[PDB]
Amino acid sequence: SNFYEERTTMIAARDLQEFVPFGRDHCKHQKESWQLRKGVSEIGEDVDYDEELYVAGNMVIWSKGSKSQALAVYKAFTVDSPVQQALWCDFIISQDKSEKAYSSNEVEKCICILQSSCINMHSIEGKDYIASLPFQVANVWPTKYGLLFERSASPREPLPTMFSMLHPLDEITPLVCKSGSLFRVQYVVDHAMKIVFLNTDPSIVMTYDAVQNVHSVWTLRRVKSEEENIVPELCIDHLWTETIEKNSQASKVFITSDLCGQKFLCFLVESQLQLRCVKFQESNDKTQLIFGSVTNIPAKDAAPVEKIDTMLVLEGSGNLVLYTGVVRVGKVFIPGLPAPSLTMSGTYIHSIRDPVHNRVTLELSNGSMVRITIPEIA
């Protein structure tokens, strides 16, 4: 007899609901995009709030609601030309004078809407900032210090390709980079370097080097007073380059933690169907990051589920698999929606997105979208 001796683990997903972005209803009527993040509840309020930032054509819809409450609040913005990009961002108002772990910078939170002609920043407190950039914007990224712009491509004096904006009314300034050697700072001018990820805490940037086909991670910080070299405000400071087969630009990047607190920086390399997960941790003197082993996890797609310290992985086969960091926990089962080897339906999960609390969106192959709950394995 087996005597309860363990062999296989199966995870019960539950609380399945059709998902259609809130903003889809409140817009003109075809390209659309959105992102979800957690909203804030009041102190000791027992409810999970979602925020959605939705974009279609000339409109941006911000909304906040709950899966448990009927009504959501929303704010619509309409501009005159197609929205290139919309994002949440924040600008430092007052720098933290304290070393204590509870202390932080006072900041001004905004919704940033980018058009061809200009950029608009709408603060939560009610200020509309209007600015424009002297060049074409390929992409913009929120950072700990505001916004970071990538310029589209159009003696020897190359124009810098990356620019920070520390306050919506301030002049933008070129980014510099510092890269350590064994045996100095300079302007970012390489067009081969592509940003793929920003994070605020820890304050880092991940880039893909399009000619050497390897990713790098950097500390994003203020320039030091030895800026003897228009003067930069921010700097990217090389931390790590992967040791690695064609290696494409990462399609998705995120941080996850396992059950015992080990963090990983994970980036999905589509061309190899791998999720590369690199351990990292803060220095014990807390001045910078330390990087450990990298693990390749087979994946078509993946999403961190932060509230419960696990990560969902979608395999090439269409199987959903739950991880905690790089340790596989088990297959995830969804009532009504079998894996492909278990159904005659042509319907499979095409992709995974919008993790908030313990819920995640599945994009299904028949066009529709479904939101599910992943239980604590805690």
Side-chain angles (χ1 to χ4, degrees):
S1 169
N2 186 45
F3 289 143
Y4 301 94
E5 205 42 68
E6 287 117 336
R7 301 177 189 177
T8 301
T9 305
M10 303 173 172
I11 313 285
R14 63 173 176 93
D15 194 13
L16 200 163
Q17 310 283 290
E18 266 196 334
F19 178 78
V20 164
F22 180 86
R24 185 184 291 167
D25 231 27
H26 300 54
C27 279
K28 175 171 187 178
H29 219 83
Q30 244 178 226
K31 275 267 171 46
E32 75 184 352
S33 49
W34 67 96
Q35 43 171 325
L36 297 194
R37 62 176 191 176
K38 44 195 186 60
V40 206
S41 59
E42 295 192 333
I43 300 156
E45 196 184 359
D46 210 340
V47 62
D48 298 337
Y49 284 108
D50 308 315
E51 287 188 15
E52 186 196 283
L53 188 57
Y54 175 92
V55 178
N58 298 347
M59 292 188 64
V60 178
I61 311 295
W62 174 91
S63 63
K64 182 191 198 225
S66 156
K67 79 169 192 287
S68 71
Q69 283 165 359
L71 191 55
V73 299
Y74 72 95
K75 173 57 190 170
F77 307 90
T78 303
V79 298
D80 58 284
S81 67
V83 176
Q84 166 172 339
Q85 192 181 342
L87 63 165
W88 289 288
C89 53
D90 63 287
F91 304 87
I92 294 167
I93 294 176
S94 175
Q95 287 200 58
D96 176 23
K97 297 280 164 178
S98 182
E99 299 263 17
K100 280 299 169 73
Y102 58 74
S103 79
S104 67
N105 298 319
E106 184 190 40
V107 307
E108 184 182 19
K109 293 171 183 180
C110 305
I111 284 167
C112 171
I113 308 180
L114 181 65
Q115 296 164 264
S116 294
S117 54
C118 61
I119 182 161
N120 285 266
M121 284 133 307
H122 306 273
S123 86
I124 61 180
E125 295 92 351
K127 301 201 172 85
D128 181 15
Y129 301 106
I130 306 174
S132 72
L133 296 111
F135 48 65
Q136 308 164 278
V137 177
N139 256 115
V140 62
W141 301 84
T143 81
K144 182 188 199 285
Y145 306 94
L147 295 174
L148 195 170
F149 296 89
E150 297 176 276
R151 184 184 94 246
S152 317
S154 83
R156 175 51 55 106
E157 310 170 50
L159 184 66
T161 54
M162 296 183 190
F163 293 87
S164 57
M165 176 192 286
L166 262 53
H167 302 93
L169 298 169
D170 287 349
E171 296 258 29
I172 62 166
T173 63
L175 193 69
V176 287
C177 63
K178 187 181 174 184
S179 209
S181 173
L182 226 31
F183 320 81
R184 311 187 187 190
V185 281
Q186 82 166 15
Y187 292 113
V188 178
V189 291
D190 193 12
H191 281 284
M193 174 178 288
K194 311 281 178 191
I195 302 194
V196 296
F197 179 79
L198 247 301
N199 198 72
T200 290
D201 178 8
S203 183
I204 56 167
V205 174
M206 193 174 110
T207 60
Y208 177 69
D209 184 344
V211 291
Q212 271 86 255
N213 298 113
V214 289
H215 297 79
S216 277
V217 180
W218 316 70
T219 302
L220 179 69
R221 51 151 179 100
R222 301 188 187 273
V223 303
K224 294 162 184 192
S225 196
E226 38 286 6
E227 15 162 307
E228 330 304 342
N229 192 13
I230 185 167
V231 32
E233 297 165 331
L234 303 190
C235 172
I236 44 178
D237 204 343
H238 187 272
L239 282 166
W240 178 90
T241 291
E242 59 174 328
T243 317
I244 307 90
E245 312 91 41
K246 182 199 165 160
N247 189 35
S248 73
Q249 174 174 317
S251 184
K252 189 188 291 202
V253 182
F254 60 81
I255 286 161
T256 192
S257 284
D258 57 19
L259 296 184
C260 65
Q262 177 68 61
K263 293 170 157 197
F264 300 75
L265 180 57
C266 314
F267 52 113
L268 186 77
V269 186
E270 212 78 63
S271 76
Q272 298 205 26
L273 289 193
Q274 297 182 334
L275 188 65
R276 309 217 168 103
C277 305
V278 57
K279 285 179 182 192
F280 70 95
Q281 72 195 51
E282 216 179 283
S283 183
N284 293 11
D285 63 70
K286 89 171 160 175
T287 48
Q288 64 187 100
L289 291 200
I290 295 186
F291 288 84
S293 89
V294 354
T295 292
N296 293 316
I297 290 170
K300 163 67 177 79
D301 205 357
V305 190
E306 294 281 35
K307 185 174 199 163
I308 65 185
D309 288 331
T310 52
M311 150 177 96
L312 265 197
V313 165
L314 176 71
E315 301 203 313
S317 58
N319 289 340
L320 265 195
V321 181
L322 191 65
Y323 280 79
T324 183
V326 295
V327 182
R328 183 190 206 270
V329 182
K331 175 174 191 237
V332 171
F333 288 79
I334 309 168
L337 189 75
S341 68
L342 290 163
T343 180
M344 303 306 284
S345 96
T347 296
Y348 60 95
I349 300 151
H350 159 258
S351 91
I352 301 182
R353 59 171 304 165
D354 309 324
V356 178
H357 301 115
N358 54 344
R359 271 176 81 70
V360 189
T361 296
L362 318 181
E363 294 202 7
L364 301 181
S365 60
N366 70 327
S368 46
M369 288 183 191
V370 146
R371 200 143 166 89
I372 61 173
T373 290
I374 308 296
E376 294 186 15
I377 71 183

